[PDB]
Symmetry: D2
Subunit: 402 residues, 4 copies
């Protein structure tokens, strides 16, 4: 009759590649399979035919990630054909949704042993073309699915607008009064902290390599590619806003478009013991929230509020906060709404998506796993991961180290 | 750790199912998904809508007007407040049932109180996709149709598991489980007959809200499911040529079609049922999934049903209705045979299924759940089972219980 | 230097965009007139055809890779017969006749076929190759009619006005009023309707068989047109403008072909010489006023031949747009309603498949000379991006 | 009554490799390069007197769409009063432009004209047919770089739709042209071309192409001067182990443009031009598509018979090298030795490349160039055409 505790066990990720960069040759399905293969190699006591489900986040699903990439990935990874899979889409929150969905399946007693993760290959996102609506139609057109609006509904544009994600971040900067200077400082600190974590070997502990064929032999992609460790305030101040001279968001204070995949095991207490797993954290809960599309970046606020209210935990009780850095403007605006200092030590202690990049489907799984990793290294207890969502949402997920 | 919470399906509704290029072909998938959501608003005035915790929607494609989280797109279009979150699930033809069971788990685990679960597919409007060039001046650009089935084939997938088309997998099931053409056609006929009777009885009308269609001289309404072929005879079935060549058994007459449609339903905890003045119609009992060989995807319901009923301690024979998805007569028959249920068992698909009705991938699983409940209400039955197959070798099963 | 005679000539009907001929591949459509010439001319020894010259404005679709050659093979002409495709946009089919004429007049050939084709219904989309790996800048463009792959240097120096925009520019610069344009358009409809009922087009037309459905009537005509109806239409380019769908040609499908021959070949192949070709000339104008292009072309030709415009017993002036048709007539000193101009109507009523239209003008001008007993005839037309072409014949 | 016609100044771009030196240059802009050079090179011309620009172009789906002759003259800075027309006989297109230009002046309908050709095969677009029905599931992209697209079932069933290399394999088979002879032919092409490049022979024909942020392209890119018979021997046939045509014994896929002035004697005098050759004539011939490479044979026969000139009277023969197989077969049918010194003395398309629309204009101008250098009188340029044709053009140095 009682709900069951749920533990995150092993977790692992590919490096994050730049658009057109180190991972651009790797099909989304094959990329998604890389962390799955590593889970298999890294957890040899598991009876693999007992995995109840693979849940994977993926925002696109038009490309080599089409037709339920979770199931494609598990087959490519060498998991038995008897294992089910399902793909979740809450845009940039998809991979976190995977984790929280997996958690709810175990908490409710419907499953014992599951994998949750996320993939996105933005390099390889395809073009789409709608069907002709009439014989001999002269209005055929291609649209890029890399990021952002396509097949725009005129009713959506008239009621809510179809602001680009950078536009929404400018709207957040405007409405919440987040200065260019503050955004650049945040971005700088993101780059510094990530450069420090990379030199410390922190990212290395999370990463499994991806092997790439060249003409004369193979290389290994080993390192997060997006980082700009040489970033300075002077460098950031010189950049032009994406949307015009009177705006504040720049490529230097924004996440990038990127490729990568991540996955982790979740299990009941019985499953941990049966499969020889090492339990690392208990999942406390997940909540979602909605906001106006035009200020989508503030979405984390109702999400975090809803979760912490229900669990009865103060925002200030968390020993780590992984706040997604879609843009410095909205990162800062969320922190301020929540009463957390712009530079508080527990937020993004190893940097975030400004430095690391953000393959939509992967980023939510990455935030959960890195929060856990951070809690282990620092000896912290509770961790909060939260991110915003295109078209105006937030997602939040809380964990507690065992 | 505290108690699990009971979960109730309340009001449910769907659009008609349209033929490919037929009655609903002009309707964008996001607008189509909004249709049942707007009806749920109209039909339950007691609900305080700003208390919906989540809209969960199934959708197999997501490359078209259904792109970038159709659940969230649809709820905004439906006029639900911007404060309501949405998320889209993809287990191919099982997506809409996955929405229901995922909703159920969210409430059962105490994370939510009031949710909407549904599904949509516009297979009419499924776009073409073109991979990016890998090199400057590449001579290798290609368009592929996303309406149904394989695209961007992985060599590794093809080598190991094959990339059989869905009709091909149904031929494989026919061969491996020895389901004869004759038996397939008889199954298909009963589906047409039963659906025709249900339509005439007004049974589908109780499930349906109309879709409005733009027209010169004034918009029209679509009220009735379009796929049905009520005049079908064994003789016409017998004369059809198989999809995959002259030695095979699967034909367009004994297969589900490619179709458009949307459906949605409310799930609520007991406290939400009370607070919003909803009618609890059934309790959700549970959901299970299972995997099989891609090449025989149609048998996927078997592991799913066994997993579910074993954990719940319910025998297959205990269910008052079984809504078994009719992707193909071959797999429909092979599943029943494995589960020890007669090919023409009165509790199985009493109002016909996807052969007559059609099967918009995302919507189908949601239809199966709501129609099962509907049938329990008409018949006074207690427990129902809804189950379906999934391309690339899966099955999904969900059990409910009236009142 | 050799006299050159036009002999037998025929055409398909002209279909509307997406209408009666929309299912017919351009190459098969081109072959239809060629087959009819074979059937209609049994004295001809077909392995002696020196060349098939065909006009075609597009060449991206089933009309790709030298449609002249594709068509003659599809029409059952021996593989020994060569073909060549010419492209001067809407004047392409006239260019074909004029080029055939030059080949025979200079003594390099004796017996040739000249024609044109366009399937505008079937015109494909085009997409540039990616210029970088993982390019996000892929785009489809319609080739049915008008600008695609615009060159920024063309735009900045000459502009890339659409054809209707240039027709507005002519109406403005040459002061051609809306009411005059609509009047001319109505006369075009009325004359074509009269010609249709009299069997005039039927004498030019060979049917297209579609595997069976038979297309045998020009489809674009709107005999129902009234001045009042024309007055109510809205200008394509805004209320301050003049050109409308009703006083403009349409987008259309069709093919035409004719035999040209030296005196020797006429006699050898038992042909009926119907007209002598007198000459062809071209000219260039500013692209933004492309519709006035006929004027330099006609002046150049008539001056060289030593003929006045007023000497022609028929003038077949392409009707891309009423504004330019009228502008041209005015410039050349011919009345807006002169009886020898377009006596059976023109492109506003009949439609204008680009590559076919010039060959149609030449064959119909000849046909009208026969009907009327006239002597000299002039066919002339405008060309996108600023040209004109003119061709003179004399009934034998 | 017929008027004599003279070829005067002539110039070309270098020939670039597919995806190589000129891949960024739009076909219309590329066409404009020789035209602008003709202006620079001929100061006595009153440019508004040019009666017509005739240009060959095989594709016309890309930036070469909608009458590239006229686009090119405008981009070159020529007055807008000058008309233009584009000709398509596939690889023979640029030769057709010259021949057509010739008939225009000879017939007295013009006095001063430009003839040339262009092809950017690098930038050839993809094409997509329109949907035939609402919600059509049958939409498809095809490459227009070279060869069959939108295949007609009736063409395929009667005549076949063999690729260009397949037709060249068919000629090898039907006319018994061995792999070894083909390779030896190819090696001589490369060798002759490397010698001519070193002698500055191509330099004299070339105007550079300038590509901003800036690179000057001034040399033919396709040449393989290190080619040995041993290297060619190692190559695998395009169409499988039992065929004979290889990448090494075939022309390539390429970009480039060329143009030249043609004039009556009156126009020569008025415009202070140098008359370099009189044009004698052009003839065309058809063959079976499946052996398109043999097309030059009927073309050359029809031309020489009409002019009363034996093939052996020619001081230079510029035979297009689409493939060594068909080049050799053409030479043998015409009674000329596989290595005759008057044939392709500076090499040809195997070394140089073949941008379809340009190649025929190149053969005519280079033929004239060679006559000037060697002191010869009569020249013959000839080439094959996809779907089974040949074209031939004869000239005589003044
Ligand atoms: S939850 C995740 C949701 N995801 C998003 O919302 C994605 C948001 N990002 C984007 O859509 C794009 O990444 C935007 C913000 C639009 C930027 O697009 P660009 O393609 O313009 O980005 P690039 O970085 O490729 O180019 C911008 C130029 O700025 C320079 N630059 C960036 N960052 C720095 C730093 N830190 N220091 C110095 N310069 C920096 C880049 O070098 C580039 O300069 P170039 O000289 O043009 O290469
Ligand atoms: S969970 C569900 C998952 N989805 C699937 O697996 C969907 C599988 N279905 C398909 O892919 C297609 O529906 C297939 C099976 C390939 C058939 O596609 P078609 O496009 O051919 O379908 P049509 O509607 O065009 O039918 C083909 C011809 O057969 C005739 N026909 C069908 N059914 C009947 C019956 N009952 N009686 C007589 N004839 C029947 C159709 O009329 C049609 O003949 P036409 O003359 O072409 O109309
Ligand atoms: S050498 C010839 C060279 N070729 C050209 O220059 C081609 C010129 N033609 C065009 O480009 C187009 O045909 C233009 C002129 C742009 C018109 O196309 P539009 O797309 O702007 O408009 P439609 O073709 O869709 O037609 C608009 C409406 O006008 C009605 N209409 C046409 N003709 C008449 C007449 N005679 N009388 C009354 N109405 C007329 C059409 O029916 C249409 O109205 P609908 O309500 O949409 O049917
Ligand atoms: S009138 C003109 C009509 N046009 C034609 O019909 C042109 C016909 N040409 C073609 O269609 C192609 O160019 C063919 C002949 C099919 C070959 O295309 P490829 O893309 O294969 O051409 P590559 O240049 O890539 O050649 C393949 C490999 O062969 C090597 N190679 C070519 N020539 C030589 C010589 N002389 N010596 C040594 N090697 C040679 C290329 O380097 C290439 O090697 P890779 O390993 O592939 O780089």
């Amino acid at each position: 009759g009682s709900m069951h505790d749920v533990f995150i066990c092993d977790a692992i990720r590919t490096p994050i590649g730049r658009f057109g960069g180190a991972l651009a040759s790797v099909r989304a399905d094959d990329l998604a399979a890389v962390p799955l293969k590593a889970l298999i190699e890294r957890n040899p006591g598991v009876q693999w035919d007992q995995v109840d489900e693979v849940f994977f986040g993926c925002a696109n699903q038009a490309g080599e990630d089409n037709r339920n990439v979770a199931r494609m990935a598990l087959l490519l990874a060498g998991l038995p054909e008897s294992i089910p899979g399902v793909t979740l889409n809450r845009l940039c929150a998809s991979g976190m949704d995977a984790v929280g969905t997996a958690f709810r399946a175990i908490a409710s007693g419907e499953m014992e042993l599951v994998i949750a993760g996320g993939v996105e290959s933005m390099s390889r996102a395809p073009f789409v073309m709608g069907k002709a609506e009439s014989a001999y139609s002269r209005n055929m057109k291609l649209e890029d699915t890399t990021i952002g609006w396509r097949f725009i509904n005129p009713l959506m544009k008239s009621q809510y607008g179809v602001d680009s994600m950078p536009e929404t971040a400018d709207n957040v900067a405007d409405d919440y009064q987040v200065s260019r200077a503050d955004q650049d400082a945040f971005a700088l600190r993101s780059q510094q902290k990530a450069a420090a974590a990379q030199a410390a070997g922190f990212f290395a502990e999370e990463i499994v390599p991806v092997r790439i064929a060249h003409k004369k032999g193979e290389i290994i992609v080993e390192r997060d590619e997006h980082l700009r460790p040489e970033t300075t305030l002077e460098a950031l101040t010189k950049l032009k806003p994406v949307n015009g001279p009177d705006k504040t968001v720049t490529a230097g204070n924004a996440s990038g478009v990127n490729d990568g995949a991540a996955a982790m095991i979740l299990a009941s207490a019985a499953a941990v013991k049966k499969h020889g797993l090492t339990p690392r954290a208990r999942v406390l809960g997940m909540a979602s929230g909605g906001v106006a599309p035009r200020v989508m970046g503030i979405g984390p606020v109702p999400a975090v509020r809803k979760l912490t209210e229900r669990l009865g935990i103060a925002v200030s009780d968390f020993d780590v906060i992984e706040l997604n850095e879609a843009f410095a403007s909205q990162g800062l605006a969320v922190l301020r709404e929540l009463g957390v200092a712009d530079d508080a030590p527990q937020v993004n202690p190893n940097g975030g998506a400004i430095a690391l990049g953000a393959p939509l489907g992967m980023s939510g799984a990455r935030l959960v796993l890195t929060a856990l990793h951070q809690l282990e290294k620092s000896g912290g207890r509770k961790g909060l991961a939260t991110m915003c969502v295109g078209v105006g949402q937030g997602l939040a997920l809380a964990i507690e180290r065992v």
